[PDB]
Design a protein around this ligand. Structure first.
Ligand SMILES: *[C@@H]1O[C@H](CO)[C@@H](O[C@@H]2O[C@H](CO)[C@@H](O)[C@H](O)[C@H]2NC(C)=O)[C@H](O)[C@H]1NC(C)=O
Ligand SMILES: *[C@@H]1O[C@H](CO)[C@@H](O[C@@H]2O[C@H](CO)[C@@H](O)[C@H](O)[C@H]2NC(C)=O)[C@H](O)[C@H]1NC(C)=O
Ligand SMILES: *[C@@H]1O[C@H](CO)[C@@H](O[C@@H]2O[C@H](CO)[C@@H](O)[C@H](O)[C@H]2NC(C)=O)[C@H](O)[C@H]1NC(C)=O
Ligand SMILES: *[C@@H]1O[C@H](CO)[C@@H](O)[C@H](O)[C@H]1NC(C)=O
Ligand SMILES: *[C@@H]1O[C@H](CO)[C@@H](O)[C@H](O)[C@H]1NC(C)=O
Ligand SMILES: *[C@@H]1O[C@H](CO)[C@@H](O)[C@H](O)[C@H]1NC(C)=O
Ligand SMILES: *[C@@H]1O[C@H](CO)[C@@H](O)[C@H](O)[C@H]1NC(C)=O
Ligand SMILES: *[C@@H]1O[C@H](CO)[C@@H](O)[C@H](O)[C@H]1NC(C)=O
Ligand SMILES: *[C@@H]1O[C@H](CO)[C@@H](O)[C@H](O)[C@H]1NC(C)=O
Lengths: 49, 193, 32, 116, 48, 48
C-alpha cells in the first residue's frame, strides 16, 4: 500500500517463496583436452580459397 | 495493414504471437452484436400484418405514416424524409478492383482504406425488411390495439380504441364521443406539423 | 484485394464448404 | 424486484401476454425466472355499438363492451365472454345521443320497476 | 443452399367499423428465461 | 416493448404529458418514435 497506516480489511501479498538453498551441477564426465596444440600450432595453414 | 506484402515483414510478424487473432475476434464479436441489437429492436412480432381493407379509421388520417405502395421501396413519407436527411458516402456500397485503380486521383478515401485491409461489412437486415417490420407493427397497432402484442390480434373500431385509451388516463370515455371531430382534426394538424 | 469467407457446417457432419468473395463480381473472375 | 415480489403492468417485461406470477431459481453464475402468463384463445366475432338511446339520452357502459349475438344486445367484460343484461346499474348516462356517432336503438332495463 | 430469409408468416385482420372479436377461453403458460449475474474472480501475480 | 405495444403509466417515459399512442418509423441506423399525448389547457379556479 506504500503507507505507514493500514485500514481495516483484507489485502493480497506476494507468492510463497520456497527457497532452494542448494546448488547442483551436472556435466558429462569428459576427461580429455581439446585439440589446442595440433590446431593452433599447425605448421601449414590452408589457403583462403 | 502492418506489412503489405514484403515477406520479410510477414516472417518477422510471427514472433509477436496471436495479437491479430485477438483483434479479429473482438471485431467479429462487435459485428455479431450489431445484428443481434437490430434483430432485438425490430423483430418483435411474428405475423406480418397487411394493411386493412383501407381507410375507415373514424376520420383519422394515417396516410403520412402508412407505407406508399407506388414507390419501388415500401417506405412512408416520413421514413423517406428521414432517409434523405441523413447523408451517407459511397451509395453503391461495393467497390471492386475495376473502379478502385481507375481515373480516381486519390480523391476517395474508400480505396485508401481498402488497400490497407480495412473493410466494411453489410448488415443482415436490409432496410427493405425493416420497412416491412415497421409496416406490420403500424397495421397491428392501428387495427387491433394492444391485443396483438399479448397474443392473437382481435379487430376493434378505432374510435372505441381511442375511448379506452382515454379511460386509461382517468378521463371518461363519453368526452371523446362528444368531441371526436375536434380530436381527429387536432391529430391531423399535429402530424402535419 | 477482396476478403474471403468460408461457410461450413460442423466438421463432424460433412466436409463440404462454400466460399464467399466480398466486394467483387463473379463475371470479372479471379474467383474459383 | 418488480416481477417476483409483485405484479407488473409493463407489457412484455416478464414474458409474453398478461403477467400473473414469477418463480426464481438459481443457476451457475446466473438466475432463471419461470413466468406464468394468461393467454386468451378461441375468439369470436360480434357486432358492437358505442352507446344506446333509451329515453333520448346516451347510455355508456360503466365497464366492458356492448355486444350483440344477432338479435339481442348485452354488455360483457373485456378479456372473457360474460354476457349480461343491459342495466342502469352497469351503465351511466351523459347528455343527448344526437352527437354520438353510430349509436343504436335499444331498451335499458331497470331492476327497480318490479318491486313497485 | 442459399436463400432469402423469411421475415414471418403473412397475415391479415378483418377490420370493420362495427365488428369486435371477443375471446371465449384462456390458457395458462409458463416461460423460462435466464440472466447471468456474475463471473469468476481472477488474480494475477505480476512479478512471478 | 412498452409504449408502442401498449399504454404506459410511467411519467415522461414517452413524451411529456399523459401518453395515448406511439408510432415507430425506421431511420439510418436508428428508430424514430412519434408519441401522441394529451395536454390539459384553459384551467379555471374553483372552491373545493
Ligand atoms: C390524408 O392526408 C393526405 C395528404 O395530406 C391527403 O392526400 C391529399 O389528397 C388531395 C386530394 O386528392 C390531393 O390534392 C393531395 O395531393 C393529397 N396529398 C398527398 C401527400 O398525397 C388525403 O386526402 C387525406 N385523406 C383524408 C381522408 O382526408
Ligand atoms: C341471442 O340471445 C337471446 C337471449 O338469450 C336469445 O333468445 C333466446 O334464445 C333461446 C334459444 O336459443 C330461446 O329458448 C329463448 O326463448 C330466447 N329468449 C327470448 C326472450 O326470446 C337469442 O336466441 C339469441 N340469438 C342468437 C342468434 O344467438
Ligand atoms: C378451454 O381450453 C381447454 C384446453 O386448453 C379445454 O379443456 C379441454 O376440454 C376437452 C373437452 O372439451 C378435454 O378433452 C381436455 O382434456 C381439456 N384439456 C385440459 C388441459 O383440461 C376447455 O374445455 C376449454 N374451455 C371451454 C369452455 O371450452
Ligand atoms: C606451440 O609450440 C610451442 C613450442 O613447441 C609451445 O611452447 C606451445 O605451447 C605450443 N602451443 C600450444 C597451444 O600448444
Ligand atoms: C458487376 O459489373 C457490372 C458492370 O458494371 C455491374 O452492373 C455490377 O454492379 C457489378 N456487380 C455488383 C455486385 O456490383
Ligand atoms: C370474423 O370475420 C372475418 C371476416 O368475415 C373472418 O375472417 C373471421 O374468421 C371471423 N372470426 C372467426 C372466429 O370466425
Ligand atoms: C361503417 O361503414 C359503413 C360503410 O359501409 C357505413 O355505412 C356506416 O355508417 C359506418 N358506421 C359507423 C359507426 O361508422
Ligand atoms: C331511435 O329512436 C328514435 C325515437 O325514439 C327515432 O327517431 C330513431 O329513428 C331511432 N333510430 C333509428 C336508426 O331508427
Ligand atoms: C386563480 O386565482 C389566482 C389568484 O387570484 C390568479 O392568479 C389566477 O389567475 C386565477 N386563475 C385564472 C384562470 O384566472
Amino acid at each position: 500500500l506504500k503507507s505507514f497506516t493500514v485500514e481495516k480489511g483484507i489485502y493480497q501479498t506476494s507468492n510463497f517463496r520456497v527457497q532452494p538453498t542448494e546448488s547442483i551441477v551436472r556435466f558429462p564426465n569428459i576427461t580429455n583436452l581439446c585439440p589446442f596444440g595440433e590446431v593452433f600450432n599447425a605448421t601449414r595453414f590452408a589457403s583462403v580459397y | 495493414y502492418i506489412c503489405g506484402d514484403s515477406t520479410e515483414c510477414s516472417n518477422l510478424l510471427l514472433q509477436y504471437g496471436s495479437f491479430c487473432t485477438q483483434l479479429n475476434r473482438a471485431l467479429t464479436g462487435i459485428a455479431v452484436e450489431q445484428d443481434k441489437n437490430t434483430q432485438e429492436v425490430f423483430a418483435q412480432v411474428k405475423q406480418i400484418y397487411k394493411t386493412p381493407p383501407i381507410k375507415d379509421f373514424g376520420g383519422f388520417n394515417f396516410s403520412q405514416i402508412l407505407p406508399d405502395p407506388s414507390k419501388p421501396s415500401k417506405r412512408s413519407f416520413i421514413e423517406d424524409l428521414l432517409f434523405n436527411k441523413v447523408t451517407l458516402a459511397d451509395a453503391g456500397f461495393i467497390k471492386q478492383y475495376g473502379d478502385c485503380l481507375g481515373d480516381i486521383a486519390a480523391r476517395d478515401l474508400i480505396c485508401a482504406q481498402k488497400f490497407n485491409g480495412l473493410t466494411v461489412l453489410p448488415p443482415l437486415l436490409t432496410d427493405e425488411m425493416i420497412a416491412q417490420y415497421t409496416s406490420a407493427l403500424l397495421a397491428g397497432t392501428i387495427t387491433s390495439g394492444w391485443t396483438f402484442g399479448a397474443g392473437a390480434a382481435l379487430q376493434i373500431p378505432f374510435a372505441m380504441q381511442m375511448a379506452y385509451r382515454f379511460n386509461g388516463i382517468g378521463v371518461t370515455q363519453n368526452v371523446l364521443y362528444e368531441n371526436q371531430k375536434l380530436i381527429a382534426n387536432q391529430f391531423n394538424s399535429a402530424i402535419g406539423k | 484485394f477482396g476478403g474471403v469467407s468460408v461457410i461450413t457446417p460442423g466438421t463432424n457432419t460433412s466436409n463440404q464448404v462454400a466460399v464467399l468473395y466480398q466486394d467483387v463480381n463473379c463475371t470479372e473472375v479471379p474467383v474459383a | 424486484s418488480e416481477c417476483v415480489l409483485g405484479q407488473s403492468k409493463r407489457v412484455d417485461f416478464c414474458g409474453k401476454g398478461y403477467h400473473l406470477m414469477s418463480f426464481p431459481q438459481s443457476a451457475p453464475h446466473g438466475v432463471v425466472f419461470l413466468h406464468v402468463t394468461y393467454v386468451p384463445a378461441q375468439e369470436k366475432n360480434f357486432t358492437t355499438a358505442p352507446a344506446i338511446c333509451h329515453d333520448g339520452k346516451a347510455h355508456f357502459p360503466r365497464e366492458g363492451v356492448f355486444v350483440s349475438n344477432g338479435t339481442h344486445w348485452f354488455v360483457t367484460q373485456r378479456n372473457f365472454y360474460e354476457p349480461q343484461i343491459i342495466t342502469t346499474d352497469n351503465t351511466f348516462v351523459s347528455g343527448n345521443c344526437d352527437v354520438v356517432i353510430g349509436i343504436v336503438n335499444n331498451t335499458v332495463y331497470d331492476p327497480l320497476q318490479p318491486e313497485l | 443452399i442459399a436463400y432469402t430469409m423469411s421475415l414471418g408468416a403473412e397475415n391479415s385482420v378483418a377490420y370493420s367499423n362495427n365488428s369486435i372479436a371477443i375471446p371465449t377461453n384462456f390458457t395458462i403458460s409458463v416461460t423460462t428465461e435466464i440472466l447471468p449475474v456474475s463471473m469468476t474472480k481472477t488474480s494475477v501475480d505480476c512479478t512471478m
